[PDB]
């Protein structure tokens, strides 16, 4: 009956495509054609952080827009003070191969993970005075690509096993598993209301998940690996930067591909994607060693950061929109403003 | 202009700097190696050999030191077939150790394809490959039976003659070495098809009982370091 099921699936996919085309009366560029362009956005490297020993694979800001955690392949997880360049903590990891770092919203815990398939959650507010591994979540069958905190007790982790997980930290167990993707899930963005999250994988498809219920609501389709994903500040759109030079903006309420940010002079893959606080600027890190700032509505390039000697591997915009921190494969992070 | 607490925080940052400089010296003095191979390939045998004599966990690590030079050798388990995404973590490893079972001719062709994927990878474009054609005690016992001829799996063997080069000095059957050198050349051709800096394949013949594999790794890594010295420092 596999033929019958495949035929029904093909018919359903065609119905989805037809319905999604039936709601595409106008394109985002047509509506945006009248608003004035942003103009040259020239951001300068204010602070440069020079502590790590090897390539930086991830950063994540704190909710205070002051502290930030950076993970390097040297086995270090450095918690930096952005304003003063001071190093607040230097956690030595048990595994040197780290692909993700997460800073809890409360500022108490920080998460790391990588080839070890373990999500290591470290406690920073201990009475002992030193950072300790509070928990080691150990249920994945593939490398961790992204960890994000929901609160102090729940984490959401994307792994190379084609599955995402929602863990209760105290119990140490996977409360929920998300099992739709057909390839390695490389990125993960949590909606501001923390009830949904979009995961981009290597199947050239992003998937929107309901955390509370465990299902996959919508599947958005890119022509290569999706390496970074980031929600729009609204909570009703998101951006996916992929291995084909392209960052695409999708909208949940319409189940569409609103815009495709690409340029003929860009050939490398996007590693990181972030939005400015307003949502008007889409910052994307590239293998070309520089970050491009796109206008998220006119789909035109607005600026270039261009201050790194190796590929930009992580990008993050503070909660207050004050700065965009770029971490590349040279040890350095750069805080642009 | 800093407050008392700000000065104390700066001093703490400088102490962290000091531990980071010590960790930098430790990180530099150690050589990172990545071990790849198939399930058929004798690969845990090699880690056992260089360990004894010198869960769902993903990365397995093996310290071993040769002539006061420390080596961290990493084997990647509990991962799926596709490797194009976690292979980027190894853009800075000194050498990639590829173990290919020379005994199994049927699966040999896919071993060459895996080798080609490793060689022509945009991230390992500057990483040398130390190649171990493993399980050769099984190769001799397989080629001295006549029940499995390479021509049944590689049609070009019938027109291949051993080159006027270094035959195995000890007693070895002259067509055992022919088959061995054909397997070697099938990888050397892929290595030399697209060559660049820091990107040289060192082929070696090994077995399970061989206890000199660590020495071979040290010699090849020394040559890799010499090439990076000749290149980074502009001497070539």
């Amino acid at each position: 009956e596999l033929d019958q099921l495949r035929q029904e699936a093909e018919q359903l996919k065609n119905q989805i495509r037809d319905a999604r085309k039936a709601c595409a009366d106008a394109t985002l560029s047509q509506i945006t054609n009248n608003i004035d362009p942003v103009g040259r956005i020239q951001m300068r490297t204010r602070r440069t952080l020079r502590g790590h020993l090897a390539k930086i694979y991830a950063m994540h800001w704190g909710t205070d827009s002051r502290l930030l955690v950076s993970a390097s392949q040297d086995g270090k997880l450095i918690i930096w003070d952005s304003y003063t360049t001071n190093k607040v903590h230097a956690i030595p990891l048990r595994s040197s191969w780290v692909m993700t770092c997460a800073y809890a919203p409360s500022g108490n815990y920080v998460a790391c993970g990588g080839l070890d398939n373990i999500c290591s959650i470290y406690n920073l507010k201990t009475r002992e005075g030193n950072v300790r591994v509070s928990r080691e979540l150990a249920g994945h069958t593939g490398y961790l690509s992204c960890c994000r905190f929901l609160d102090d007790n729940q984490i959401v982790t994307s792994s190379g096993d084609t599955t995402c997980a929602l863990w209760d930290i105290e119990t140490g167990q996977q409360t929920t598993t998300f099992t739709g993707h057909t390839g390695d899930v490389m990125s993960l963005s949590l909606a501001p209301d923390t009830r949904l999250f979009v995961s981009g994988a290597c199947d050239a498809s992003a998937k929107l998940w309901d955390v509370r219920e465990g299902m996959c609501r919508q599947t958005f389709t890119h022509e290569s690996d999706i390496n970074a994903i980031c929600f729009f500040p609204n909570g009703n759109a998101f951006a996916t930067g992929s291995d084909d030079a392209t960052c695409r903006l999708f909208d949940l309420r319409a189940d569409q591909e609103l815009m495709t940010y690409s340029h003929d002079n860009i050939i490398c893959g996007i590693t990181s994607v972030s939005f400015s606080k307003s949502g008007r600027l889409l910052l994307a890190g590239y293998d070309d060693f520089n970050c491009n700032v796109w206008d998220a509505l006119k789909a035109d390039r607005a600026g270039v950061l261009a201050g790194h000697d190796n590929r930009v591997s992580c990008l993050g915009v503070t909660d207050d929109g004050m700065a965009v921190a770029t971490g590349s494969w040279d040890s350095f992070l750069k805080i642009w403003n | 202009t800093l407050s008392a607490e700000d000065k104390a925080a700066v001093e703490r940052s400088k102490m962290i700097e000091k531990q980071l400089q010590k960790d930098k010296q430790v990180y530099r003095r150690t050589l990172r190696l990545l071990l790849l191979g198939a399930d058929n390939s004798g690969k845990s045998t090699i880690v056992k050999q260089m360990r004894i004599y010198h869960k769902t966990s993903g990365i397995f690590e093996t310290k071993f030191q040769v002539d006061k030079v420390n080596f961290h050798m990493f084997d990647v388990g509990a991962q799926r077939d596709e490797r194009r995404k976690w292979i980027q973590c190894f853009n800075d490893v000194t050498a990639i150790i590829f173990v290919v079972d020379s005994s199994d001719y049927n699966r040999l062709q896919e071993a060459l394809n895996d080798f080609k994927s490793i060689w022509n990878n945009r991230w390992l474009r500057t990483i040398s490959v130390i190649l171990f054609l493993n399980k050769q005690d099984l190769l001799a016992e397989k080629v001295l039976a006549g029940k499995s001829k390479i021509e049944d799996y590689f049609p070009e063997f019938a027109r291949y003659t051993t080159p006027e080069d270094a035959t195995p000095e000890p007693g070895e059957d002259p067509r055992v070495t022919r088959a061995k050198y054909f397997i070697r050349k099938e990888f050397v051709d892929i290595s030399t098809a697209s060559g660049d800096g820091r990107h040289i394949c060192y082929p070696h013949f090994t077995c399970s009982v061989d206890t000199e594999n660590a020495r071979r790794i040290f010699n090849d890594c020394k040559d890799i370091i010499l090439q990076m010295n000749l290149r980074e420092y502009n001497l070539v």
Partner: single-chain antibody
Framework: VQLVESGGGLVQPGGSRKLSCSAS????????MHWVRQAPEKGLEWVAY????????YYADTVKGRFTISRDDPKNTLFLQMTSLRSEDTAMYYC??????????????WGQGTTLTVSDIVMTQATSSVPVTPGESVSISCRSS???????????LYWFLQRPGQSPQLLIY???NLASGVPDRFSGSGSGTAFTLTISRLEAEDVGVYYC?????????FGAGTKLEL
């Protein structure tokens, strides 16, 4: 965390004595450590400070030259070598734990103290004693001769509580932040040169002497402390 100090007793004037506090239960090597003292019936007075890594040592004016502070990190013990003692140096000496980074809460833990008997941003706390009944809000205020609002943004005032017959316990750090383990009923407020601590719904087991300490510039000055009695 535990931090027990020893070495006190009778010292004839002009003598010398080594006070040693042993720290068990926390990362001693990564914490700056202070020596404070309380006279037989008086307030707290900062004595010395040895930084993490032993790279920054500060002494009080009435202490400088005579006292040498040092730490043995591997053995987890800090020593105050007191030379040429005087009658004014009699006190219960407390060893105070203190880390410094962004968000840190210095002066977290205090030792039980050693009794040693020998045979400047002035901070004023006018209320030397405030009568009170449990269940009612209290306000303890202290001023300063110099504004503590540094240009970076945070005012460096610390409110401590010393229950009868116990070591001081940190209540508020930096004039608005609540320490770890202190009830939410305590609140701190004010501006530079004027600070107020409010206890809403006062509940006994929190009566005792309240001190306010500056941390803008060394030496760290304390106050006389308001004595809340039930």
């Amino acid at each position: 965390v535990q931090l027990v100090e020893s070495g006190g007793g009778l010292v004839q004037p002009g003598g010398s004595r080594k006070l040693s506090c042993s720290a068990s239960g926390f990362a001693f090597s990564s914490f700056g450590m202070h020596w404070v003292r309380q006279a037989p019936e008086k307030g707290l007075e900062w004595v010395a400070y040895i930084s993490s890594g032993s790279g920054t040592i500060y002494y009080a004016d009435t202490v400088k030259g005579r006292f040498t502070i040092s730490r043995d990190d591997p053995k987890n013990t800090l020593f105050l070598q007191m030379t040429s003692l005087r009658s004014e140096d009699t006190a219960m000496y407390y060893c105070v734990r203190s880390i410094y980074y962004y968000g840190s809460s210095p002066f977290d833990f205090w030792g039980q103290g050693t009794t040693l008997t020998v045979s400047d941003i002035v901070m004023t706390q006018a209320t030397s004693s405030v009568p009170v009944t449990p269940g009612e809000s209290v306000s303890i205020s202290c001023r300063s001769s110099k504004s503590l609002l540094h240009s970076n943004g945070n005012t460096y005032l610390y409110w401590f509580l010393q229950r009868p017959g116990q070591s001081p316990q940190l209540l508020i750090y930096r004039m608005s932040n609540l320490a770890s383990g202190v009830p939410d009923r305590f609140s701190g407020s004010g501006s530079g040169t004027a600070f107020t601590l409010t206890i809403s719904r006062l509940e006994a087991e929190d009566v005792g002497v309240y001190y306010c300490m500056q941390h803008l510039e060394y030496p760290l000055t304390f106050g006389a402390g308001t004595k809340l009695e039930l």
